[PDB]
Structure 1
Amino acid sequence: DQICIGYHANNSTEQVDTIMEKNVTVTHAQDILEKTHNGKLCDLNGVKPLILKDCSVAGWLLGNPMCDEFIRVPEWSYIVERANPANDLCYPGSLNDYEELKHLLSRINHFEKILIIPKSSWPNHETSLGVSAACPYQGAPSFFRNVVWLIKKNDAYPTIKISYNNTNREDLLILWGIHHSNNAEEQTNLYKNPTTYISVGTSTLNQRLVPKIATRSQVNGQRGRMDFFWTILKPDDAIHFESNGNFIAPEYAYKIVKKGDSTIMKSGVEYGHCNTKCQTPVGAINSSMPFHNIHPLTIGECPKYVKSNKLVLATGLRNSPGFIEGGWQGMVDGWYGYHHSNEQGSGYAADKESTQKAIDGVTNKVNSIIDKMNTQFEAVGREFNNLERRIENLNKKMEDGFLDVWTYNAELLVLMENERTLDFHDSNVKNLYDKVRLQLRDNAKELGNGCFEFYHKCDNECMESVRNGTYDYPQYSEEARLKRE
């Protein structure tokens, strides 16, 4: 006749590492690292991204003939660009502050193309001959759709003086450019005048562009270049152009309303008609876990990126194949409990109160570590050019330093807390064993294995009497007194 107190055992193969012990198989565990993604590019917080297909932001904006004339998506959360975009700037050249303009255009709440300077405005210049082979539409020479390459008319290029007053209530993005000639003959042939200039003026802008006529390498079959420039014209301000040649004049402009900032994501995954709080170039993370290892360049409210394959928190008990030699595989209905083997039968019992008290606390342990990382803001990727490598290395030092801080702190926290959890489980059993110690002072002997040697007989009902804390010690005290022999 004896009563026993032990812990639970199941068939789990999951192991956890603690600060002092490694590879400790436990009954229950919880990974706080997310490794699952959608494999698709989703909407970010309800807004659809801008997916440019093998075209760059410059190509799309300036109107490369090989790009969708109108995306007519007025709003986007992020811009999706392929790694090495194909079409780009068909006529060789450059766009000023490109990387800044891209940051400006990463998240837009209104985008609408408008016609600010119609070709009718150029009565003494040729608007139809400004085309090239480097800019093709269906094999045919063409040019950027949103600008106008003006050339001489009647061997004469009269000085242009045109102004546009932004009557709209929205800011305007206005793009224009300068054509660099190749020799003096080419200069006079397109623009009668040999010495040329472009002057651009707004309330904040004061620009003097002058063409550079030199020998250059051939790119897309052209040795000349075209440098482009942009400005943001505020409501009720006016832009003032003046030139006598080499002018790539604006024809269309863009109404921008910008309330937020994002980044240009470089990815090739397809739009999945989904929504997500966190987008990575490889797929979307819908998770609440504090840490992830999917991809560094996330956008949105994301878990912290760590260099870890697994971060498993123990939520259970040491599994089995110290007074309590091991756990009971037969106690399938509890975490802490009792065992009896009286004259009538032998059975396994579970301590509901002690069990729930621990299940609540251990889940509170996981939820605390999970939910205290409520610090989730917005994020960005890569945005620096070839002569900005020092700032790029700055961003990399930062990302790596944060990588090291989160990974050390997360891996150590799991190790420190898992040691405490397993200890917390050990202390719970010992207090239960001390509960029956005080209930059966001399009416039972200390066997030492977590079991108690009943001098007197207990029925299955007396066993539930030691359990339930409903046992009378003087009821059987004299029987134990005689059992001493």
Structure 2
Amino acid sequence: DQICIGYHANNSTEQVDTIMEKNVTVTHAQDILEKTHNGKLCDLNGVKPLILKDCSVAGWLLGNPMCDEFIRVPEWSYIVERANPANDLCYPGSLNDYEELKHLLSRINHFEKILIIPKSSWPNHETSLGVSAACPYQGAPSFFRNVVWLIKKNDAYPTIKISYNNTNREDLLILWGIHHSNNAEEQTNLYKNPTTYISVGTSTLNQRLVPKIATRSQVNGQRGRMDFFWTILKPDDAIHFESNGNFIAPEYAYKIVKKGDSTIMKSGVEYGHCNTKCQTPVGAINSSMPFHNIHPLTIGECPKYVKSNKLVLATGLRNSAGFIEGGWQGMVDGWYGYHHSNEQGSGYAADKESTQKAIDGVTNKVNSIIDKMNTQFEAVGREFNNLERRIENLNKKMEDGFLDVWTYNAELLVLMENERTLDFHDSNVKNLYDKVRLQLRDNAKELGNGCFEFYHKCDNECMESVRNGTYDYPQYSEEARLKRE
């Protein structure tokens, strides 16, 4: 007749690795790595992205004829540009500080196109003949919609002096430009004056733009260039333009309210009509998990990116070395338990108030690991041009350096803490074995099989008494002494 102390077992094929042991098969386990994404672009904390479809920020702002998605997205959380946007700056040219404009325009609380300078304001200039084939609507010469290309009237280009005073109590992104002619004849056939200039003036702005007339290669059919510039006119300031020619003048402008920053996501996944806290270029994540293996370029309150394919914590115990050779599959109601063998019956009876302390403790470990990184911050990817490659490497080295920090720390944490969990189970069961012993030492033989050879025949009642620690060895003393000497 004997009683034994044991640990739970099940059908789990789940494996965890530890610092000193690999491919340990455990009963229960929880992966702290989120590997799933919805596959759709979604809203970020309630606000909808500005999905410029085959358009660029420059083409959308200046008003490329081919771009016809609604300018009326009043607020956005991030801009979604396709990589290599199809339609951008139809007339060959540039936009100064495109990348800084895009950054400002990444998250905008209020975007309202207003007309600041009417086409009626150019009485001595022609507003209808500033078109090019390169910028084409329905197979006809057209131009940028929100900017005007002014040419001569009656072989004359009288000097322009104009001003717009922002009266709107809201900042204004005003876009203007210069046309670079290809020859002196082209200069005198669109403008009339040979030497030209553009002056732009605000409180912060002093500009002098002179055309560069020289032979250039042809892009989109034209050997001339249009270089655009921008400023943010403050609530009560005036912008002053002066030109004797070569002026792509502002007609429309944009009201800007700037509160918060984001990035331009480059992706092709469709808007899924959803909301998320974390947005990847390939999908969106809904998770409290601490780490993720999806995409480096994430926007929102996102998990930390690591290179791991799996990060399996151990929420349970081993499946079938120590004094207790194996696990009892038949035990169902507890992790730690007793086995009573006597004449009345032999069965498995688990010990709660030991399993319960274990399940709460291991659960708190998992939750402490998951929640103590509530350091989740708003973060984004970035964009740098082809003459900022050195700054790009700083970004790559920072992003890669943080990756290697988390990947090493996370895996070691999993390996270190999983070992402690498995030994915490081995320590917990010995405390049950030691509690049963030290209460019946003389009456049973410590076989070391995890079992005690009960010299005294114990009924089902003293089994529960041993479980409750209420075994009186005087009550059962001599029946064991007869088997003893």
TM-score bracket relative to the smaller structure: over 0.9
Task: For residue 437 of structure 2, give the secondary structure of its aligned residue in structure 1.
Answer: helix
Asked if structure 2 preserves the Cα contact closer than 8 Å seen for 1:161 and 1:240, the reply is: yes
Q: Distance in 2 between matches of 1:33 and 1:70?
A: 39
Deviation, structure 1 residue 438? 1.1
- The question of whether the paired residues in 2 share the 8 Å contact of 1:9 and 1:318 is answered with yes
Equivalent position SS for 2:354: helix
* Kept in 2: contact 1:76–1:109 (CA 8 A): yes
- Range that drifts further, 196-205 or 470-479: 470-479
CA contact (8 A) 2:65 2:144 kept: yes
- Whether the aligned pair in 1 keeps the contact of 2:197 and 2:246 (CA below 8 Å) is yes
Identity, in percent, stands at: 100
SS at match of 1:353: coil
In structure 2, the residue matched to 1:68 is 68
TM-aligned CA deviation for residue 321 of structure 1: 13
Cα distance, 1:21 vs structure 2: 0.7
User: Matches of 1:139 and 1:460 in 2, distance apart?
Assistant: 96
Deviation at 1:470, TM superposition (A): 2.3
Alpha-carbon distance, 1:299 to partner: 0.3
Alignment-derived partner of residue 397 in structure 1? 397
Distance 2:232 2:387 in 1: 25
Q: What CA distance in whole angstroms lies between the structure 1 residues aligned with 2:71 and 2:210?
A: 34
1:483 CA drift (Å): 2.1
Q: Residue by residue, what CA displacement relative to the aligned partner does 1:418-446 show, whole Å, maximum 9, x if unpaired?
A: 11110000001111100111110201111
The Cα shift of 1:365 comes to 0.6
Shift of residue 333, structure 1, vs aligned partner: 1.8
Cα offset for 1:482? Answer: 2.2
Structure-2 change in CA distance of 1:193 and 1:40 (3 Å): same
Could you list the per-position Cα deviations for residues 120-146 of structure 1 after superposition, in whole angstroms to 9, with x for gaps in the alignment? 000000000000010000111100000
Aligned to 2:109: 109
Whether 1:351 and 2:351 are equivalent positions in the alignment is: yes
1:63 and 1:69 in contact (8 A); partners too: no
Residue 346 of structure 1 and its aligned partner are, at CA, apart by: 1.1
Counterpart CA distance in 1 for 2:10 and 2:343 is: 28
Number of residue-to-residue matches in the alignment = 485
- Secondary structure of the residue aligned to 2:422 is helix
Is the deviation greater in 472-481 or in 254-263? 472-481
Q: How far apart in 2 are the matches of 1:56 and 1:16?
A: 48
1:68 Cα shift? Answer: 2.1
**Any conservation in 1 of the 2:198–2:241 contact (CA below 8 Å)?**
yes
Secondary structure of 2:100's counterpart equals helix
Aligned counterparts of 2:358 and 2:282: Cα–Cα separation in 1: 40
For the 8 Å contact 2:292–2:304, the answer to whether it is kept is yes
Distance 1:336 1:464 in 2: 15
Residue aligned with 2:255, SS: strand
1:386-442: CA deviations, max 9, x gaps?
000000011001000001100000011110001111000000111110011111020
TM-score (ref. length: structure 1): 0.99
CA separation of 1:368 and 1:196: change in aligned 2, threshold 3 A: same
Per the TM alignment, residue 332 of structure 1 is displaced from its structure 2 partner at its CA by 1.7
The Cα shift of 1:69 comes to 6.3
Q: Deviations over 1:135-169 (max 9, x none)?
A: 00011110000000000000111000000000001
SS state at 1:174 partner: strand
Is 1:301–1:377's contact at 8 Å kept on the other side of the alignment? yes
Deviation at 1:305, TM superposition (A): 0.4
CA distance in 1, matches of 2:258, 2:432: 64
Q: Deviations over 1:179-217 (max 9, x none)?
A: 000000000000011110000000110000000000000
Structure 2 CA distance, aligned partners of 1:177 and 1:325?
83
Shift of 1:380: 1.3
Structure 2 length as normaliser, TM-score? 0.99
Evaluate the alpha carbon distance shift between residue 64 and residue 334 of structure 1 in structure 2; reply closer, same or farther with a 3 A threshold: same
Instruction: Kindly state the Cα deviation for residue 381 of structure 1 after the two structures are TM-superposed.
Output: 1.2
SS in 1 for 2:134: strand
How large is the RMSD of aligned CA atoms in angstroms?
A: 0.9
Displacement after TM superposition at 1:259 (Å) = 0.5
Deviation at 1:465, TM superposition (A): 1.1
The 1-side partners of 2:13 and 2:361 are apart by 23
1:71 deviation in Å?
2.4
Task: Please show how residues 99-138 of structure 1 align to structure 2 within 5 Å.
Answer: 99-138=99-138
Quick check: 2:52–2:69 contact (8 Å CA) kept in 1? no
1:309 aligns with 2:309: yes
Tell whether the 8 Å contact from 2:127 to 2:149 is kept in structure 1 after alignment.
Answer: yes
Task: Point out where structure 1 has 5 or more consecutive residues left out of the alignment.
Answer: none
Instruction: Confirm or deny: 8 A CA contact 2:53 2:69 kept in the other structure.
Output: no
Structure 1 Cα separation of the partners of residues 109 and 68 of structure 2: 20
